[PDB]
Amino acid sequence: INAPVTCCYNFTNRKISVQRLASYRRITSSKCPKEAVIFKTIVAKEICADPKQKWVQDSMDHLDKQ
Amino acid sequence: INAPVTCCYNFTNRKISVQRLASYRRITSSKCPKEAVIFKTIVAKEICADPKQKWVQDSMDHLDKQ
Ligand SMILES: [K+]
Ligand SMILES: [K+]
């Protein structure tokens, strides 16, 4: 209710090295234009990424393990 | 550009104990309806709070120190 609302309005066009990534979360809220991934870098930078892209899915798999 | 956009659309009506708070950040973006505080709890819960309220300002001061 008093939770913040986070959405992604664009998706990155570059592959982020698995070396630069710390975590991610998914956006699934219907308040947003679409479903998204937000990667967080080892410098705590937040980048919107397309959940349908293979590199994005691979990086989340990597982070789920490594 | 591919940074996520976070806004607060409501503000909490209760004072959160300084004991339950871990951090906060400010929302200042013009993409949002107004300026906000998002407190994060010691359970990693995120709560929107009115920056103009004294208890909110006091809690940020506490977190800046303690
Ligand atoms: K794009
Ligand atoms: K309120």
Side-chain angles (χ1 to χ4, degrees), chain B residues 39-53:
Chain B
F39 289 113
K40 197 171 177 183
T41 65
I42 60 170
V43 173
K45 190 194 187 168
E46 296 205 327
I47 305 155
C48 291
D50 189 351
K52 303 187 169 153
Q53 283 186 113

Side-chain angles (χ1 to χ4, degrees), chain A residues 1-13 25 38 46-49, chain B residues 1-13 25 38 46-49:
Chain A
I1 328 142
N2 299 305
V5 76
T6 308
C7 301
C8 282
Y9 291 94
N10 211 70
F11 287 143
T12 188
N13 298 310
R25 58 194 176 99
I38 306 160
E46 296 205 327
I47 305 155
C48 291
Chain B
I1 328 142
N2 299 305
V5 76
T6 308
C7 301
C8 282
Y9 291 94
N10 211 70
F11 287 143
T12 188
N13 298 310
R25 58 194 176 99
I38 306 160
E46 296 205 327
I47 305 155
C48 291

Side-chain angles (χ1 to χ4, degrees), chain A residues 1-65:
Chain A
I1 328 142
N2 299 305
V5 76
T6 308
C7 301
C8 282
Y9 291 94
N10 211 70
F11 287 143
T12 188
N13 298 310
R14 225 148 303 257
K15 201 193 180 185
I16 317 163
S17 308
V18 286
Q19 302 96 247
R20 305 193 193 111
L21 299 173
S23 60
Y24 73 89
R25 58 194 176 99
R26 297 193 179 270
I27 301 300
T28 51
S29 175
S30 55
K31 308 160 189 298
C32 305
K34 56 204 297 169
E35 290 188 11
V37 177
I38 306 160
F39 289 113
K40 197 171 177 183
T41 65
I42 60 170
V43 173
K45 190 194 187 168
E46 296 205 327
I47 305 155
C48 291
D50 189 351
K52 303 187 169 153
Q53 283 186 113
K54 178 161 172 299
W55 88 257
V56 178
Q57 306 172 179
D58 284 350
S59 305
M60 292 190 274
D61 276 349
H62 189 272
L63 292 181
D64 284 356
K65 307 157 196 169

Side-chain angles (χ1 to χ4, degrees), chain B residues 15 18 23 29 47 62:
Chain B
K15 201 193 180 185
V18 286
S23 60
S29 175
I47 305 155
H62 189 272

Side-chain angles (χ1 to χ4, degrees), chain B residues 46-65:
Chain B
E46 296 205 327
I47 305 155
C48 291
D50 189 351
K52 303 187 169 153
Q53 283 186 113
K54 178 161 172 299
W55 88 257
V56 178
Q57 306 172 179
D58 284 350
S59 305
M60 292 190 274
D61 276 349
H62 189 272
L63 292 181
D64 284 356
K65 307 157 196 169

